[PDB]
């Protein structure tokens, strides 16, 4: 419903926050991306704890290789993983 | 209803016959064939409707029987002038509850 | 007054009147709440 | 082979059967084919085949499995083809036929499958085939035909049997997931359409099945949610849901039992996302359905407790000789009472028992009564007394107790509440013994549940009576023989206490206990977040339960039953029933505790904070302050006063911080919760007129501090301040409405009985922090006269919103909410107490003050017309709606007419721009299109801003105008009509109308008391149109009829004027029709009309105006995600 | 007394049933007690309460409700002397109730009190006066006598129910004197064979 | 902190609740999805006109060819719809 609309709105809010946190126009540098991540998902997600994972995620997110992430890429993949977690939780765990 | 039978679901059916002698203006009632003390006297030229007041207690509530005992005319003969001397019981369509 | 009237006259026209409340002979019988069963506690008798 | 062939042939024919849509369309070929198939296969033969029984496996031959050879016998798949043919070809449409086939052929099959569901038989080939046959052919058919089940009371026993059987099969194991889904869908489909009273027995089973909250229990949650949501009317309304009767006492008892069982089990159980999300709707539904004031006939303080049928242990304990004497006495009494039953049945003594003979050999005196039968009669009594001893029930002889039967009479002897309860538990033990016997029988049979296996208490009252007769007989014989027995009933200790026993009472008590738990774990969470951050969170279970269940439950319950909590005993606002003073007290306690819980701790709640605040709003709405203030515990009184005082402290703390981590926390807490919740509380107080009673003493002092701090903040200037201004203004307006002290009129305060100074003694209010003089309560607030003179001066100056941002946003709402509340308290108002001695009014407000005020607001808006952004304007209009009701008539000529006229001129100019743009094409058209769009948007904003006041004014003065002709009113009609003409002409204007009403979240119907009918412009035109018709002459209606035709022809305005001019002598004739006669009569009866219709130019202009209005009114009334 | 019989119903005669058009009449409540007013079909039953059956669509004042096959809150209660104007528009199949010349509105804000009415036999003015109540039914035989007709309804084109009836409209009331009547052939409970 | 988790859990609640009432308790069938979208978005969706459009979009959205919309697929599509809404925001001018 409008609640799901507000969910997309929250995604957009959090994105634009860290896109301008370091001033990277509207696109997440490696540092913006890291800080973003450990801010939004405290717990299940790791960037400081897993810097090699952060680097591999930099490469994977930036298939284009730009090193910056716009809205499409992370929305797709991050939404997929973050929702599929609970689907697995119900299924088995 | 007998006092002993009172308080029990009776397996029998009760029959109450109401007799009116028009010439004498007299009315009597017989329960199951046994005469009852209750009697009434009415003034001449009075009109009386057969009637029954009942609180339903079973699917089969009551039945108006227009019969005739020995040497007593049925109700239809009194009710309709044409049948004034006909002794065979009748229930023409006009007669209804 | 008239008895069991459903119509009345009035300034603008006829008034239709609904059924009237009627007093019953029993209404005159004074019925207080029974109190014989009640027995006075001593702390209430001294106040009595 | 032969069964297989015939089944395959029938299946083939059924598949050949035409589709339902073709049958409905009536295709002759399809109907012919269906007729051929019906002739080939007789229906009765299909019913017989479905009826035919299937051999089911048995545990015979020394516990072995006798499974029929599937390939060599009659199999469910064979019946599947028959069912398919019966559905596709013959179809089921008659309720009687449905019941007939269901009973004869299907119901036996589902009974057999349920029976075979046991462990040994679970995996048998025949059992699996039955599951397949059912879930593939039978269950879907019943689901499709479910609606036919309405009004089936005549076969209620069979319907209830079907429901029980289907539920048992659903629980059955070894089912595939699809099979279980099909069965569950059938269950919901049946329960949706079946009558509520039917569900009594099924719901009774569920009361015991669900509370365990196992995996198999989830579907019942949805089932109960749907059923209770659908039938809430039938369960709570005293009258009962239309045509469906009313709930029964036992049914309501089952409802309460189920509610509390689910509540307790959910609270105890650890977290589970799916289970909690499924539960919360269910708990809300039962909470709504159950009556607020319902009281159970029987209450169990002990609240004892797939099923446990083991009886209460009695054999372990021994029997005293005293109780043995009682055993002999009750044995002879029971023998005598049995002989009395025999004499009632006409049975007598005999040599042997024979029904026809009606004689009995044991019908002999107790002296000759055989010992074996004597032991038979005594042993139940021995067990009962041993059960009493095991339960620790102690029986003491006060005195010894006192063929042709001679039974001691028990009707005269009664039983206290204790003894009635004891009879209940004795019947429970007897029923448990019965269930133990049934348990041995079911063990031998290999499965199943006896219908009476369900707990005794859950059993219906009449069914409970069956064991209760013997239980209560034993209890009364104990009493007569002199046994006094008592265990110290906590039930009697609680006493009847109907108020405490009301369901709402227990619900609220549990809520308060959970509230204490909330305080505890919020303190723990605050400590851990402050320091020693760690993730254990032992209360985590309680936190999740609170947030997920209790808060939504609070919201739903206190929204659905707000009326019951507010209705006073004297006056019942709701449908029926009124809460107790104690119930109101716990409501207030909950409100204060929740306010304290959320105080300064909103960030901790986070995503749950909005739900918490919604619960605050609902509790504030349902709160009844007047009763608690008049009478209530000093502790709850102090809780409410402390909430008010802390709110004042928080808002003043705002004020100074705003003037310039804890500060930011306070800011966000006040912005999110305290201000809106306080606003809602004040609004409720104002609506219910509770202000005089509730706002007193310390409450008044806190309200003064809040008001004056808000006003000082408003006077202060800052960007974040102007951000906060709207909410502050709304809150202060509500506070002004609630306030029972004329703060704006200190000079006359002494008259006000309801004032802090008058109530408190001079010796008092010095110990308190109260200024000696009322003027110093706070001097910052100006007096009413100076406020009025100022606001008039600024209005005349016509300065800008930026010039006076504080005024419009705060002072105007304050003052427009102030005048109405104090107008009645002041003079010049209906004086109901005129005959009695009336003290001089505390306020001096008069209608002229309100009139001047309204003229001022009109002046400010008219001055501010045309500005790019005036979002404050809509809030000002809504806040100013209330005053307009008492506006004096001359306002229309002084302010409205020029005001709306300027807007009419602006509309003309902007539409002129629109036609010029239309003439412009391509890039010329595109440029300036957004321009004209913006002008339309700002004009629409101003237009909505102005109307609601105008609408409410019209409502008040329409009587005057329509009673007596008014040239000014006629001019206003012309003007509004022209505006509507522009509206109808310009499509861009309409779309921008919709854009504004949607974007600005305007509730369009609220102003009247979103669609075109809801659109204000058409609403305004309709509201004024009667005046336009009235000012016209009845005769001229034919001219309007012709003018509307010309407008349909799309002729120019001058063209239609000239048409009427040349057709001027086409007037209607009074002699022509009679209606015109009484039209003419009324028209003449109204004065001043002898001068009407003197000029044909007047006639034609009037007709043209009205026709232009009606034609466009008729046009109005009657006309990327995928990408 | 029995509540099914407690309130007297006064309706117009059956021969005045209106099949089409827009009709108006007024009902002044000389007392604030329980009183219903509206439009009933010609086959209205004396014993059944108004608006508790499909036959009648009415507005009850003392509580502020609209009754048809039950009850639903609607409008506001009247005070003594208030005039309820009842309007029926058969071209639109709607019924409107106005108080003191102002159109009453339901909770949803809809102006029409009742909607989607099938003409059927017709419609007649009807009122029900609970015990101890007095009302005044103006059917517009004298158009000037109406109080709020000009304010509301006149411009809308509604007609006084008896605007052109030279003789006063005849009324039938629910006489509460029991009398014997033949057992209905379709009586739900009692069957005579 | 956990605001994206809040948005994600709200998403889960909404689409699971919209799946269960209408069909199989968890996944997204065609009818489930049609009524779901009706519940979800108004004034923006163009699929309201035809349910057959919903059907064909379901067919594509079920590249796995099962007739049931997977949670990951649905979330990625609604992320693309977030993309479309951000494009709407920029187009506004
Ligand atoms: Ca960036
Ligand atoms: Ca990239
Ligand atoms: Ca699904
Ligand atoms: Ca798929």
DSSP letter for each residue of B26-65? EEEEEETTEEEEEEEE--TT------------SS------
Distance A83 CA to ligand 2 centre (A): 22
Could you count the other beta carbons within 10 Å of the beta carbon of residue D953? 18
Contact residues, D window 730-759, toward E, CB-based 8 Å cutoff:
none
The residues with which E160 forms a beta bridge, in sequence order, are E24
Contact E144 D1026 (CB under 8 A): no
Residues of C in contact with E127 (CB under 8 A): 16
How far apart are the C-alpha atoms of D923 and D911, rounded to whole Å?
Answer: 20
How far apart are the C-alpha atoms of E50 and E69, rounded to whole Å?
Answer: 9
Q: Are strands E65-67 and D348-349 parallel, antiparallel or unpaired?
A: unpaired
Give residues with Cβ within 8 angstroms of E84, minimum separation 6: E26, E27, E28, E29, E37, E59, E61, E78, E97, E98, E99
Instruction: Quote helix, strand, coil % in chain D, to nearest 5.
Output: 70, 0, 30
| Given resolution (angstroms) | 3.6
Beta strands in D269-386 (DSSP E): 348-349, 359-360
Helix (H, G, I), strand (E, B) or coil at D75: coil
How far apart are the C-alpha atoms of D436 and D456, rounded to whole Å?
Answer: 13
Residue with tokens 């089932």: D223
Distance F65 CA to ligand 4 centre (A): 6
Q: Are A38 and A48 in contact (CB under 8 A)?
A: yes
Helix axes D218-230, D200-209, angle to 10 degrees: 140
The residues with which E97 forms a beta bridge, in sequence order, are E86
Could you count the other beta carbons within 10 Å of the beta carbon of residue D33? 18
Residues of E in contact with C17 (CB under 8 A): 129, 133-134
Nearest CA in chain A to F4: A40
How far apart are the C-alpha atoms of D221 and D507, rounded to whole Å?
Answer: 20
Nearest CA in chain E to B62: E192
Optimal mutation site among E51, E109, E141, E188, interface D, most CBs of chain D within 10 A: E109
Q: Are D14 and D85 in contact (CB under 8 A)?
A: yes
How far apart are the C-alpha atoms of D635 and B81, rounded to whole Å?
Answer: 91
Q: Note the residue count of chain D.
A: 1123
Two tokens at B76? 């239809």
Contact D607 F6 (CB under 8 A): yes
Q: Are D93 and D20 in contact (CB under 8 A)?
A: no
Optimal mutation site among D272, D274, D1121, D1122, interface F, most CBs of chain F within 10 A: D1121
HSE of A69 in the Cβ direction (CA atoms, 13 Å)? Answer: 27
Q: Are D1048 and D1017 in contact (CB under 8 A)?
A: no
Q: Are D684 and D623 in contact (CB under 8 A)?
A: yes
Q: Distances from the Cα of E31 to the Cαs of C3, D494, F10, in angstroms?
A: 20, 48, 57
Could you count the other beta carbons within 10 Å of the beta carbon of residue A86? 18
How far apart are the C-alpha atoms of E149 and C36, rounded to whole Å?
Answer: 65
Q: How many angstroms from the chain centroid is the CA of residue B90?
A: 14
Q: Note the residue count of chain E.
A: 193
Two tokens at D287? 């909470």
How far apart are the C-alpha atoms of D394 and D483, rounded to whole Å?
Answer: 9
Q: Is the dihedral of CA B73, B78, B79, B85 positive or negative?
A: positive
How far apart are the C-alpha atoms of D334 and D150, rounded to whole Å?
Answer: 47
The residues with which D394 forms a beta bridge, in sequence order, are D486
The closest alpha carbon to D326, from D396, D407, D404, belongs to D396
Q: How many residue pairs bridge chain A and chain F with CB atoms within 8 Å of each other? A: 85
Residues of F in contact with D1121 (CB under 8 A): 41, 44-47, 81, 84
Residues of B in contact with E192 (CB under 8 A): 96-97
Two tokens at C25? 């002979």
Q: Is D213 left (phi over 0), alpha (psi -120 to 50) or beta?
A: left
- Could you give phi then psi for residue E10, rounded to 5 degrees? -115, 125
- Going by the DSSP 8-state scheme, the letter that residue A26 receives in this structure is T
Contact A11 F12 (CB under 8 A): no
**What is Dmax (Cα atoms) for chain C?**
67
Contact residues, E window 159-188, toward B, CB-based 8 Å cutoff:
182-183
How far apart are the C-alpha atoms of D1053 and D131, rounded to whole Å?
Answer: 79
- Could you give phi then psi for residue D585, rounded to 5 degrees? -65, -45
Contact D181 F24 (CB under 8 A): yes
Two tokens at E87? 């309007």
Angle at D753 (CA atoms; ends D748, D755), nearest 5 degrees: 75
How far apart are the C-alpha atoms of D743 and D747, rounded to whole Å?
Answer: 9
Contact residues, D window 958-977, toward E, CB-based 8 Å cutoff:
958-959, 962-963
Contact A43 F2 (CB under 8 A): yes
Residues of D in contact with E152 (CB under 8 A): 1026
Could you count the other beta carbons within 10 Å of the beta carbon of residue E20? 9
| Minimum-distance CB partner of A83 among F39, F71, F81 | F71
Q: Are D525 and D454 in contact (CB under 8 A)?
A: no
Q: Do chains F and E touch (3 or more CB pairs under 8 A)?
A: no
Residues of A in contact with F81 (CB under 8 A): 8
Helix axes D967-985, D897-919, angle to 10 degrees: 20
D188 burial class (0-12, 13-18, 19+ CB within 10 angstroms)? middle
How far apart are the C-alpha atoms of D428 and D468, rounded to whole Å?
Answer: 8
Nearest CA in chain D to A10: D607
What is the nearest CA distance from F65 to chain D, expressed in angstroms? 19
Taking only Cα atoms into account, the Rg of chain C, rounded to an integer number of angstroms, comes to 24
Nearest CA in chain E to C9: E136
- Extract long-range pairs of D506-512: CB within 8 Å, 24+ residues apart: D506/D260, D507/D287, D507/D557, D508/D583, D508/D586, D508/D587, D508/D590, D509/D586, D510/D263, D511/D550, D511/D554, D511/D586, D511/D590, D512/D586, D512/D589, D512/D590, D512/D593
Residue with tokens 């006489």: E175
The closest alpha carbon to D1043, from D1032, D1028, D1058, D1029, belongs to D1058
Q: Distances from the Cα of D617 to the Cαs of D590, D729, D1005, F38, in angstroms?
A: 12, 18, 23, 29
H or E segment to which residue E73 belongs: strand E71-73
Q: Is the dihedral of CA D13, D18, D24, D26 positive or negative?
A: negative
How far apart are the C-alpha atoms of D818 and D738, rounded to whole Å?
Answer: 9
Q: How many residue pairs bridge chain D and chain E with CB atoms within 8 Å of each other? A: 40
Q: Is the dihedral of CA D331, D337, D342, D345 positive or negative?
A: negative
E150 touches chain D (CB under 8 A): yes
Elucidation method: cryo-EM
Distance D11 CA to ligand 4 centre (A): 33
Helices and strands: H and E segment counts in chain F: 4, 0
Q: Are strands E159-160 and E22-29 parallel, antiparallel or unpaired?
A: parallel
How far apart are the C-alpha atoms of B80 and B92, rounded to whole Å?
Answer: 9
Two tokens at D180? 């279980």
Q: Is the dihedral of CA D94, D98, D101, D104 positive or negative?
A: negative
HSE of D666 in the Cβ direction (CA atoms, 13 Å)? Answer: 16
Q: Are D578 and D567 in contact (CB under 8 A)?
A: yes
How far apart are the C-alpha atoms of C4 and C20, rounded to whole Å?
Answer: 7
Residues of E in contact with C12 (CB under 8 A): 28, 136, 138, 145
Q: Distances from the Cα of F16 to the Cαs of D177, D274, D500, in angstroms?
A: 18, 10, 40
- Could you give phi then psi for residue D755, rounded to 5 degrees? -140, 150
Q: Are D689 and D636 in contact (CB under 8 A)?
A: no
F20 burial class (0-12, 13-18, 19+ CB within 10 angstroms)? middle
Residues D417/D421/D424/D426 CA torsion (nearest 10 deg): -120
Q: Are B66 and B91 in contact (CB under 8 A)?
A: yes
Q: Do chains B and C touch (3 or more CB pairs under 8 A)?
A: no
Q: Are E85 and E101 in contact (CB under 8 A)?
A: yes
- Could you give phi then psi for residue B65, rounded to 5 degrees? -105, 120
How far apart are the C-alpha atoms of D720 and D394, rounded to whole Å?
Answer: 76
**What is Dmax (Cα atoms) for chain B?**
46
How far apart are the C-alpha atoms of E68 and E59, rounded to whole Å?
Answer: 9
- Going by the DSSP 8-state scheme, the letter that residue D1046 receives in this structure is H
How far apart are the C-alpha atoms of D573 and D587, rounded to whole Å?
Answer: 18
Two tokens at D706? 């809040």
HSE of D938 in the Cβ direction (CA atoms, 13 Å)? Answer: 16
Give residues with Cβ within 8 angstroms of D1084, minimum separation 6: none
DSSP letter for each residue of D714-775? HHS--HHHHHHHHHHHHHHHHHHHH--S-TT-GGGGGG-SSSHHHHS-SSTTTTTT--SSGG
Q: Distances from the Cα of D257 to the Cαs of D210, D290, D303, D379, in angstroms?
A: 11, 11, 10, 34
Taking only Cα atoms into account, the Rg of chain E, rounded to an integer number of angstroms, comes to 17
HSE of D382 in the Cβ direction (CA atoms, 13 Å)? Answer: 14
Two tokens at D487? 């265990």
How far apart are the C-alpha atoms of D1068 and D1042, rounded to whole Å?
Answer: 12
How far apart are the C-alpha atoms of D657 and D663, rounded to whole Å?
Answer: 7
The residues with which D496 forms a beta bridge, in sequence order, are none
Two tokens at B17? 């016959």
Q: Distances from the Cα of D18 to the Cαs of D23, D58, D89, D1079, E137, in angstroms?
A: 7, 42, 8, 65, 62
Q: Do chains E and D touch (3 or more CB pairs under 8 A)?
A: yes
Q: Distances from the Cα of E188 to the Cαs of D156, D245, D600, in angstroms?
A: 21, 17, 67
Contact D1082 E144 (CB under 8 A): yes
Terminal alpha carbon distance of chain E? 33
Optimal mutation site among A6, A7, A73, interface F, most CBs of chain F within 10 A: A7
Q: Note the residue count of chain A.
A: 93
Q: Distances from the Cα of D436 to the Cαs of D307, D457, D464, E83, in angstroms?
A: 11, 16, 17, 73
How far apart are the C-alpha atoms of F21 and D728, rounded to whole Å?
Answer: 43
Q: Are F67 and F30 in contact (CB under 8 A)?
A: yes
Residues of F in contact with D222 (CB under 8 A): 20
Give residues with Cβ within 8 angstroms of D516, minimum separation 6: none
Angle at D191 (CA atoms; ends D185, D196), nearest 5 degrees: 170
Ligand nearest to the CA of A77: 2
Q: Distances from the Cα of D249 to the Cαs of D255, D298, D447, in angstroms?
A: 10, 10, 33
D151 burial class (0-12, 13-18, 19+ CB within 10 angstroms)? exposed
Helix axes D719-738, D634-659, angle to 10 degrees: 150
The closest alpha carbon to D380, from D305, D434, D459, D454, belongs to D434
Q: Is the dihedral of CA E178, E183, E185, E186 positive or negative?
A: positive
The closest alpha carbon to D654, from D677, D670, D642, belongs to D670
How far apart are the C-alpha atoms of D589 and D640, rounded to whole Å?
Answer: 8
The residues with which D353 forms a beta bridge, in sequence order, are none
């Amino acid at each position: 419903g409008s609640e799901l609309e507000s969910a997309m709105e929250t995604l957009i809010n959090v994105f634009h926050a860290h896109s301008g946190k370091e001033g990277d126009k509207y696109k997440l540098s490696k540092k913006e991306l890291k800080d973003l991540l450990q801010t939004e998902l405290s717990g299940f997600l790791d960037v400081q704890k897993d810097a090699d994972a952060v680097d591999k995620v930099m490469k994977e997110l930036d298939e284009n290789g730009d090193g910056e992430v716009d809205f499409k890429e992370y929305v797709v993949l991050v939404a997929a993983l973050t929702v599929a977690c609970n689907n697995f939780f119900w299924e088995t765990s | 209803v007998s006092p002993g039978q009172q308080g029990r679901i009776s397996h029998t059916d009760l029959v109450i016959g109401c007799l009116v002698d028009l010439a004498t203006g007299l009315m009597t009632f017989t329960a199951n064939g046994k005469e009852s003390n209750t009697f009434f006297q009415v003034e001449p030229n009075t009109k009386l409707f057969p009637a029954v007041f009942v609180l339903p207690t079973h699917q089969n509530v009551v039945q108006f029987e227009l019969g005739k005992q020995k040497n007593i005319m049925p109700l239809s003969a009194a009710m309709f002038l044409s049948e004034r001397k006909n002794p065979a019981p009748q229930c023409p369509p006009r007669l209804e509850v | 007054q008239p008895i069991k009237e459903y119509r009345r006259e009035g300034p603008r026209g006829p008034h239709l009147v609904g059924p009237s409340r009627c007093l019953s002979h029993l209404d005159f019988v004074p019925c207080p709440v029974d109190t014989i069963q009640i027995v006075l506690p001593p702390h209430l008798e001294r106040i009595r | 082979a032969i069964m297989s062939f015939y089944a395959a042939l029938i299946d083939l024919l059924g598949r050949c059967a035409p589709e339902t849509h073709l049958i409905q369309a009536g295709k002759g070929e399809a109907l012919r084919i269906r007729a051929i198939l019906r002739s080939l296969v007789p229906l009765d033969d299909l019913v017989g085949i479905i009826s035919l029984p299937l051999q089911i496996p048995t545990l015979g031959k020394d516990g072995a499995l006798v499974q029929p050879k599937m390939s060599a016998s009659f199999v469910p798949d064979h019946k599947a083809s028959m069912v398919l043919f019966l559905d596709r070809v013959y179809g089921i449409e008659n309720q009687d036929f449905l019941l007939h086939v269901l009973d004869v052929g299907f119901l036996p099959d589902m009974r057999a499958a349920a029976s075979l569901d046991t462990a040994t038989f679970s995996t048998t080939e025949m059992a699996l085939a039955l599951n397949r046959y059912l879930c593939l052919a039978v269950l879907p058919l019943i689901t499709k035909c479910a609606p036919l089940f309405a009004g089936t009371e005549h076969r209620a026993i069979m319907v209830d049997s079907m429901l029980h059987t289907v539920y048992r099969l659903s629980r059955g194991r070894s089912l595939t997931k699809a099979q279980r889904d099909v069965i569950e869908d059938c269950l919901m489909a049946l329960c949706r359409y079946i009558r509520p009273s039917m569900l009594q027995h099924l719901l009774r089973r569920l009361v015991f099945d669900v509370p365990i909250l196992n995996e198999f229990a989830k579907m019942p949650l949805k089932l109960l949610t749907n059923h209770y949501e659908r039938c809430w009317k039938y369960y709570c309304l005293p009258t009962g849901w239309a045509n469906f009767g009313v709930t029964s006492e036992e049914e309501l008892h089952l409802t309460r039992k189920l509610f509390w069982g689910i509540f307790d089990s959910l609270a105890h159980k650890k977290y589970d996302q799916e289970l909690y999300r499924i539960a919360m709707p269910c708990l809300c539904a039962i909470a709504g359905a159950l009556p607020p004031d319902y009281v159970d006939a029987s209450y169990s303080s002990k609240t004892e407790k797939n099923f446990d049928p083991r009886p209460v242990e009695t054999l372990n304990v021994i029997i005293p000789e005293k109780l043995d004497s009682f055993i002999n006495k009750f044995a002879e009494y029971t023998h005598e009472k049995w002989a009395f039953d025999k004499i009632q049945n006409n049975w007598s003594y005999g040599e042997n028992i024979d029904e026809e003979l009606k004689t009995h050999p044991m019908l002999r005196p107790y002296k000759t009564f055989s010992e074996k039968d004597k032991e038979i009669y005594r042993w139940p009594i021995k067990e009962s007394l041993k059960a009493m001893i095991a339960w620790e029930w102690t029986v003491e002889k006060a005195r010894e107790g006192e063929y042709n039967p001679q039974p001691p009479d028990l009707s005269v002897v009664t039983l206290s509440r204790e003894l009635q309860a004891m009879a209940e538990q004795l019947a429970e033990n007897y029923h448990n013994t019965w269930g133990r016997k049934k348990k041995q029988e079911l063990e031998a049979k290999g499965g199943g549940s006896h219908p009476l296996l369900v707990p005794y208490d859950t059993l219906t009252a009449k069914e409970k009576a069956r064991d209760r007769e013997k239980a209560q007989e034993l209890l009364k014989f104990l009493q007569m023989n002199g046994y006094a027995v008592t265990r110290g009933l906590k039930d009697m200790e609680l006493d009847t206490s109907s108020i405490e026993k009301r369901f709402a009472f227990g619900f609220l008590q549990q809520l308060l206990r959970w509230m204490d738990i909330s305080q505890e774990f919020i303190a723990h969470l605050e400590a851990v977040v402050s320091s020693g951050r760690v993730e254990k969170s032992p209360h985590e279970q309680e936190i999740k339960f609170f947030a997920k269940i209790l808060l939504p439950l609070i919201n739903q319950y206190f929204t659905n039953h707000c009326l019951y909590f507010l209705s006073t005993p004297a006056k019942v606002l709701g449908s029926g029933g009124h809460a107790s003073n104690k119930e109101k007290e716990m409501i207030t306690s909950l409100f204060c505790k929740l306010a304290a819980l959320v105080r300064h701790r909103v960030s901790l709640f986070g995503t749950d904070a909005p739900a918490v605040v919604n619960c605050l709003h609902i509790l504030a709405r349902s709160l009844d302050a007047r009763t608690v203030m008049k009478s209530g515990p000093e502790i709850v009184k102090a809780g409410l006063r402390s909430f008010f005082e802390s709110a004042s402290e928080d808002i003043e703390k705002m004020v100074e911080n705003l003037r310039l981590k804890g500060v930011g926390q306070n800011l966000t807490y006040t912005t999110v919760a305290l201000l809106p919740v306080l606003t809602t509380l004040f609004q409720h107080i104002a609506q219910h007129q509770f202000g005089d009673d509730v706002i007193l003493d310390d409450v008044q002092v806190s309200c003064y501090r809040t008001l004056c701090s808000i006003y000082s903040l408003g006077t202060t200037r800052n960007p974040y301040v102007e951000k906060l201004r709207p909410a502050l203004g709304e809150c202060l307006a509500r506070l002004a409405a609630a306030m029972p002290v004329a703060f704006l009129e200190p000079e006359l305060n002494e008259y006000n009985a309801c004032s802090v100074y008058t109530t408190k003694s001079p010796r008092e209010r010095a110990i308190l922090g109260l200024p000696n003089s009322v003027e110093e309560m706070c001097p910052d607030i100006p007096v009413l006269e100076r406020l009025m003179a100022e606001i008039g001066g600024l209005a005349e100056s016509g300065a800008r919103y930026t010039e006076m941002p504080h005024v419009i946003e705060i002072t105007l709402p304050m003052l427009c909410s102030y005048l109405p509340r104090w107008w009645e308290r002041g003079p010049e108002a209906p004086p109901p107490a005129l005959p009695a001695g009336a003290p001089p009014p505390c306020t001096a407000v008069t209608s002229d003050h309100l009139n001047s005020l309204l003229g001022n607001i009109l002046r400010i808006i008219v001055n501010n017309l045309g500005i790019d952004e005036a979002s404050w304007m809509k809030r000002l209009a809504v806040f100013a709606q209330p005053i307009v009701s008492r506006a004096r008539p001359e306002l229309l000529r002084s302010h409205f007419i020029p005001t709306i006229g300027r807007l009419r001129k602006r509309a003309g100019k902007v539409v002129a721009e629109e036609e010029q743009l239309r003439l412009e094409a391509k890039a010329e058209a595109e440029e300036g299109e957004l321009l004209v769009r913006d002008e339309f948007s700002v004009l629409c904003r101003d237009l909505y801003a102005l109307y609601p006041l105008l609408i409410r004014y019209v409502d008040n003065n329409r009587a005057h105008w329509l009673t007596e002709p008014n040239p000014n009113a006629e001019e206003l009609f012309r003007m509004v009509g022209e505006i509507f003409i522009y509206w109808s002409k310009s499509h861009n204007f309409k779309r921008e109308e919709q854009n504004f009403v949607v974007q600005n979240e305007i509730n369009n119907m609220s102003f009247l008391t979103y669609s075109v009918q809801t659109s204000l412009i058409v609403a305004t035109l309709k509201k004024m149109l009667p005046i336009g018709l009235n000012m016209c002459a009845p005769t001229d209606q034919d001219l309007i009829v012709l003018a509307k035709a010309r407008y349909a022809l799309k002729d120019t305005d001058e063209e239609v004027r000239e048409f009427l001019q040349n057709n001027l002598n086409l007037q209607g004739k009074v002699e022509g029709s009679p209606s015109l006669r009484w039209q003419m009569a009324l028209y003449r009866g109204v004065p001043g009309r002898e001068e009407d219709a003197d000029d044909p130019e007047k006639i034609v202009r009037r007709v043209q105006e009205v026709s232009a209005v009606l034609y466009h009114l008729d046009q109005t009334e009657h006309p990327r995600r995928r990408a | 007394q029995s509540r099914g019989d407690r309130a007297r119903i006064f309706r117009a005669e059956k021969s005045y049933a209106v099949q089409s058009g827009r009709w108006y009449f007024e009902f002044e409540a000389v007392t604030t007690g329980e009183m219903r007013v509206g439009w009933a079909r010609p086959e209205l039953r004396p014993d059944v309460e108004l608006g508790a059956d499909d036959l009648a669509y009415v507005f009850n004042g003392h509580r502020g409700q609209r009754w048809h096959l039950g009850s639903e809150p609607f409008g506001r209660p009247w005070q003594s002397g208030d005039v309820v104007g009842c309007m029926i528009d058969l071209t639109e199949n709607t019924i409107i109730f106005t108080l003191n010349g102002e159109v009453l509105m339901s909770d949803s804000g809809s102006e029409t009190a009742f909607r989607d009415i099938e003409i059927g036999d017709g419609f007649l003015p009807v009122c029900s006066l609970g015990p101890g109540q007095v009302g005044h039914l103006n059917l517009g035989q004298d158009v000037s006598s109406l109080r709020f007709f000009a304010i509301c309804g006149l411009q809308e084109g509604f007609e006084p129910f008896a605007i052109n009836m030279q003789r006063p409209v005849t009324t039938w009331f629910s006489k509460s004197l029991p009398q014997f009547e033949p057992v209905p052939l379709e009586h739900p409970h009692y069957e005579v064979a």
